């Protein structure tokens, strides 16, 4: 007397198909926190967490109980590691949530990082930093030309 059934249970049915996709297949946990924490050392994310916007999102992300300073000077002369380590995890949530994308652009961070941040490719984001981690050293890092022996090679 409707179309198929009278009244079937819903909503609570979605919370079942939504977890089926995110069953967290789990993988080589060997290095998960110390990984990103090393790619985005505090000195690298100093201003990041110094941003009220970033702090306002990271603060609530906390399991309720912890907190974060305000300025960068304090972040480097205050936090010991407990909040920072968690901050790294929360950073992935905000970055993966796609809510940090906009901010990731404010700082003017590389387009590859913002592009990954907008895509939530936390993997390509940190990768961009791991690939650009090098400030600009070239005193021995420049493999442009291979050899191009425009003449009889000597051996």
Question: In the chain, where are the structural domains located?
Answer: 10-135
Nearest in space to 44 (alpha carbons), one of 137, 138, 133, 125: 133
Helices (H) and strands (E) in the chain, counts: 9, 0
Topology annotation, domain 10-135: uronate isomerase, domain 2, chain A (1.10.2020)
DSSP secondary structure letter of residue 140: S
Contact 126, 36 (CB under 8 A): yes
Picking from 127, 97, 102, 99, the residue whose alpha carbon sits closest to that of residue 113 is 127
Q: Please indicate the experimental technique that yielded this structure.
A: NMR
Which two tokens mark 87?
């901050």
- Using CA atoms, how far apart are residues 125 and 70, in angstroms rounded to an integer? 25
Rounded CA separation 140/155 (Å):
25
Q: What is the Cα gyration radius of the chain?
A: 23
- Gap between the Cα atoms of 63 and 86, Å rounded: 9
Cα 34 to its chain centre, rounded Å, is: 13
């Amino acid at each position: 007397s409707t179309a198929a059934s009278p009244t079937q249970p819903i909503q609570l049915s979605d919370l079942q198909s939504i977890l089926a996709t995110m069953n967290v297949p789990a993988g080589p946990a060997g290095g998960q926190q110390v990984d990103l924490a090393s790619v985005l050392t505090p000195e690298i994310m100093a201003p990041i967490l110094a941003n009220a916007d970033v702090q306002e999102r990271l603060l609530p992300y906390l399991p309720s109980g912890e907190s974060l300073p305000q300025t960068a000077d304090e972040i480097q002369n205050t936090l010991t590691s407990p909040q920072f380590q968690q901050a790294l995890g929360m950073f992935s949530a905000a970055l993966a949530s796609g809510q940090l994308g906009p901010l990731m652009c404010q700082f003017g961070l590389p387009a590859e990082a913002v592009e990954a941040a907008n895509k939530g490719d936390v993997e390509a984001f940190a990768k961009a930093m791991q690939n650009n981690a090098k400030p600009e050293q070239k005193e021995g890092d420049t493999k442009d030309k291979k050899d191009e022996e425009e003449d009889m090679s000597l051996d």
